Design a protein around this ligand. Structure first.
Ligand code: NAG
Lengths: 132, 135, 134
């Protein structure tokens, strides 16, 4: 039970972010065991452990560049990029394992760019690999 | 019981799609690296043995030039996530994505070539997945 | 060792070592996770026990003029490949991922099969974990 933690979220075409935080949100929740993925955007770790994270953020409008940072408690840990102005729906993708303690916050930030065209079909997933 | 489940497959040649695959549009992988539980069948379809959360990932590599491709991860005949590879005039291009799904027993997960033809083959393409935890 | 995982990042834009140029092994300086310490300082993973392991990588470059091919290697042999390059963009990633059956002491690592890492490979990642022992 308490060792079972996972979330998976997708950006659809729903039409329900700030220049400060620039948090990328995912409206369609596919998995949320434990309900620790909150506000369509932020994962809050329930316990100390190793967690897997992966994401694909779609650069839809072709002539733009984006940079996406995976954030841990307000600080960047990994980065992804998409800036091929010949390509439509190019993914800025990366993944990582992290050592998290209880109440650690992990989310995606649009560090650079504007996601012109929207970011439909973008994905963001995470799960507890094992507790420590 | 059936708590260890995982598969992993790769397209090892540049051979063209089979005549059957042109009518189902289901992308298949001939080289099976992992198939614990033997739940990955027909070199293409994963059948969930039990209720739980399952991870999936895929990298479909197209050559130049098959037309712009769209790959959907399918769950019981309906698309869940999609990836795109529009040509950037290079020798090879990749349509990639991954996701966690809540699956029930006998649920079927597979890859569909929604758009495009994969002319020139899809060598080096990969498709993987595993049970994260039963539910 | 039921709990085995590593995750590593290339944190700088520094050129590869002369040794690295010789071995073609892509190395990572920043280790975020290394439970069991089976990911060595030479950026090679040594499987502690028989089991199914997950591996993912992203090799990111700022200079993409020439083609790069990255192979995931298992005891000196390629298992999967990733391609990038021959482009002029901000940053591009050669990426792929796979599950592998490993026997104990099997060696898994990234080799630059084609191309170079002129300009550095900052922000590149390489991760792996034991899904379950067999
Ligand atoms: C290794 O090769 C790269 C690519 O040509 C080059 O930039 C780098 O300077 C080489 N390393 C050394 C120590 O010369």
């Amino acid at each position: 039970a308490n060792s079972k933690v996972a979330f998976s979220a997708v950006r659809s075409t729903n039409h329900e972010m700030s220049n400060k935080t620039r948090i990328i949100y995912f409206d369609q929740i596919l998995v949320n065991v434990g309900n620790f993925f909150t506000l369509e955007s932020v994962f809050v770790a329930p316990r100390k452990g190793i967690y897997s994270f992966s994401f694909h953020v779609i650069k839809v409008y072709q002539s733009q560049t984006i940079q996406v940072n995976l954030m841990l408690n307000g600080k960047p840990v990994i980065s992804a990029f998409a800036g091929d102005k010949d390509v439509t729906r190019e993914a800025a993708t990366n993944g990582v394992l992290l050592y998290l303690d209880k109440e650690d916050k992990v989310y995606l930030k649009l560090e650079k760019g504007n996601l012109l065209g929207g970011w439909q079909y973008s994905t963001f997933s995470g799960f507890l690999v094992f507790p420590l």
